[PDB]
Design an enzyme around this catalytic site. Structure first.
Site, PDB file in Angstrom:
ATOM      1  N   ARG A  50       0.853  -1.202   0.000  1.00  0.00           N
ATOM      2  CA  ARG A  50       0.000   0.000   0.000  1.00  0.00           C
ATOM      3  C   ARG A  50       0.884   1.246   0.000  1.00  0.00           C
ATOM      4  O   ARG A  50       1.390   1.656   1.045  1.00  0.00           O
ATOM      5  CB  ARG A  50      -0.944  -0.032   1.214  1.00  0.00           C
ATOM      6  CG  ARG A  50      -1.935   1.127   1.258  1.00  0.00           C
ATOM      7  CD  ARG A  50      -2.881   1.120   2.417  1.00  0.00           C
ATOM      8  NE  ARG A  50      -3.701   2.308   2.543  1.00  0.00           N
ATOM      9  CZ  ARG A  50      -3.385   3.448   3.107  1.00  0.00           C
ATOM     10  NH1 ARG A  50      -2.179   3.584   3.649  1.00  0.00           N
ATOM     11  NH2 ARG A  50      -4.299   4.395   3.180  1.00  0.00           N
ATOM     12  N   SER A 121     -12.957  -3.192   1.195  1.00  0.00           N
ATOM     13  CA  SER A 121     -13.200  -2.475   2.453  1.00  0.00           C
ATOM     14  C   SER A 121     -14.703  -2.188   2.530  1.00  0.00           C
ATOM     15  O   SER A 121     -15.272  -1.728   1.520  1.00  0.00           O
ATOM     16  CB  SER A 121     -12.470  -1.136   2.461  1.00  0.00           C
ATOM     17  OG  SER A 121     -11.045  -1.336   2.499  1.00  0.00           O
ATOM     18  N   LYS A 150      -4.349   6.270   8.004  1.00  0.00           N
ATOM     19  CA  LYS A 150      -5.138   6.580   6.829  1.00  0.00           C
ATOM     20  C   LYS A 150      -5.980   7.820   7.186  1.00  0.00           C
ATOM     21  O   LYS A 150      -6.521   7.842   8.291  1.00  0.00           O
ATOM     22  CB  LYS A 150      -6.063   5.442   6.416  1.00  0.00           C
ATOM     23  CG  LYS A 150      -7.018   5.786   5.271  1.00  0.00           C
ATOM     24  CD  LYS A 150      -7.906   4.594   4.951  1.00  0.00           C
ATOM     25  CE  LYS A 150      -9.110   4.933   4.106  1.00  0.00           C
ATOM     26  NZ  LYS A 150      -8.798   5.559   2.806  1.00  0.00           N
TER      27      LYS A 150
END
Ligand SMILES: Cc1ncc(C[n+]2csc(CCOP(=O)(O)O)c2C)c(N)n1
Ligand SMILES: [Mg+2]
Length: 226
Positions: A50, A121, A150
């Site tokens: 990521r 998600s 995040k």
């Protein structure tokens, strides 16, 4: 973990989710590939590449980092998942892809990736159900606890959605995410999740190997005890 010719089974999916480490270069002050290596040695069961936002790598430099992280996962025998970037997943022959509600539509991604692992998600019950009807192999539910890693997250939900999904009789593989540490992981498993996922608890640890090992030991205990 070779080239898949069938969808992953739910049993194997739920084993992989146990200790699901997620990382990019901007999530640690140490050498990023070294951190990934140490997490895998300690016991992470799945890894997600990521690399986005902040002062993340781009271009050729990002691709070359992804190849080194993928090689670390092959040496440990753990599957390599790519966040967001369907083209990168296909070009590297990754084991799978993770997407969210603002990313490419799950049905289109499932079409593009064949029998590769697909994670979505989700924050609400309709989103879990939609992800399942779209062909996801697992869902990432959260944020369980407060987190800053995040930026743009949805509201903190504790284990409420996990319990609600199991109450409606849904058996899809679930990983909990958001502010998970070794101190607060057990209740995520007791509520019915198949694993926990984390960035900071491992990536920013003084000792990422020992942090991964402690998560692996604790999660094993709690999966047998619920
Ligand atoms: C499996 C999966 N489920 C959801 C997401 C999105 N996501 C939700 S909260 C968060 C930050 C966690 O950091 P920390 O552990 O430091 O709180 C992330 C990246 C994803 N990329 N993969
Ligand atoms: Mg995304």
């Amino acid at each position: 973990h070779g080239i898949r010719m069938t969808r992953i089974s739910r049993e194997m999916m739920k084993e992989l989710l146990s200790v699901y480490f997620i990382m990019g270069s901007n999530n640690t002050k140490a050498d990023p590939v070294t951190v990934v290596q140490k997490a895998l040695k300690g016991g992470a069961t799945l890894y997600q590449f990521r690399e986005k936002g902040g002062d993340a790598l781009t271009g050729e430099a990002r691709i070359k980092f992804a190849e080194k992280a993928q090689a670390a996962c092959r040496e440990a025998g753990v599957p390599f998942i790519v966040n967001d970037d369907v083209e990168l997943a296909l070009n590297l022959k990754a084991d799978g892809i993770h997407i969210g509600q603002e990313d490419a539509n799950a049905k289109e991604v499932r079409a593009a990736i064949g029998d590769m692992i697909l994670g979505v998600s989700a924050h609400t019950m309709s989103e879990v159900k939609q992800a399942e009807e779209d062909g996801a192999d697992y869902v990432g539910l959260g944020p369980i606890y407060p987190t800053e890693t995040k930026k743009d997250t949805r509201a903190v939900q504790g284990v409420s959605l996990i319990e609600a999904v199991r109450r409606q009789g849904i058996s899809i593989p679930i990983v909990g995410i958001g502010g998970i540490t070794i101190d607060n992981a057990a209740p995520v498993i007791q509520a019915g999740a198949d694993g926990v996922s984390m960035i900071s608890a491992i990536s920013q640890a003084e000792d990422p190997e020992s942090a991964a090992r402690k998560f692996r030991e604790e999660i094993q205990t709690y999966k047998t005890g619920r």
